[PDB]
Design a protein around this ligand. Structure first.
Ligand code: ZYW
Length: 247
């Protein structure tokens, strides 16, 4: 059936000639084989749906999110109301639990890859950098460096191998920091970085931590933990106090 390419989104918005259903089409001219492979395993309300692909230049048919990206809900230097931040983080955690549940790591979690549907539901998007980190119940450590510097965990910069799961968790905390303060805390989690050094020294009277409430800030203290082995895990995030706070 015929789809009209209405407009460019980033990827183009497509509308069905008969049903008028909307979808998004990723157009890549020749990573991609794996993107498709991974997309074929994914079925979750907090992950962008994969409809299919055509090998004409390659076409990926992906759920369309009229809400836009999460960054457009963050007023620079301000953030967003705490109740919206929490809801998005709840949904972000649901998405991430699912992926890790079937052994997949996104590896590039950031507001540019968190989309919103019409009810403002968050959808994890773009599995171009994603990889399988558990297969046949065996975990594989990662050694390739992927992601975006401000959202990347510190072990990815100093260690030759690392666990996939705590990396995604760190990035979710960076995203949470952004949702509540409108800014990113550091350019990268390296010790040459004054800002990351200040955090490691508990100077939370500076931004972005000054703008964050003590309850959500206590959770960030647990996520932005340099030792990936001491870093909080997702099941324990779900028991955190701000996480379960009525807002
Ligand atoms: N802002 C990052 C995204 C926004 N994009 C989308 C938008 Br906007 C809405 N739905 C989509 N599905 N897949 C991607 C996508 C296209 C790629 O750029």
């Amino acid at each position: 059936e015929d789809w009209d390419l209405v407009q460019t989104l980033g990827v183009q918005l497509a509308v069905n000639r008969v049903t008028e259903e909307a979808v998004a089409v990723k157009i890549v001219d020749m990573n991609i084989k794996k993107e498709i492979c991974i997309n074929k395993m994914l079925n979750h309300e907090n992950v962008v749906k994969f409809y299919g692909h055509r090998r004409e230049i390659q076409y990926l048919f992906l759920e369309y999110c009229s809400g836009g990206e999460l960054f457009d809900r963050i007023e620079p230097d301000i953030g967003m109301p705490e109740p919206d931040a929490q809801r998005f983080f709840h949904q972000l955690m649901a998405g991430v639990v699912y992926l890790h549940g079937i052994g997949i790591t996104h590896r590039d979690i950031k507001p540019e890859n968190l989309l919103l549907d019409e009810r403002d539901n968050l959808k994890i998007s773009d599995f171009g950098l994603a990889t399988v980190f558990r297969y046949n119940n065996r975990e594989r450590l990662l050694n390739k460096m992927c992601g975006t510097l401000p959202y990347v965990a510190p072990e990815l910069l100093k260690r030759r191998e690392f666990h996939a799961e705590p990396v995604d968790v760190w990035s979710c905390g960076i995203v949470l920091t952004a949702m509540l303060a409108g800014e990113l805390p550091w350019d990268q989690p390296s010790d040459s970085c004054q800002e990351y050094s200040d955090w490691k020294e508990k100077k939370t009277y500076l931004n972005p931590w000054k703008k964050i409430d003590s309850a959500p800030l206590a959770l960030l203290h647990k996520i932005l933990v340099e030792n990936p082995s001491a870093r909080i895990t997702i099941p324990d995030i779900k028991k955190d106090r701000w996480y379960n706070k009525p807002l």
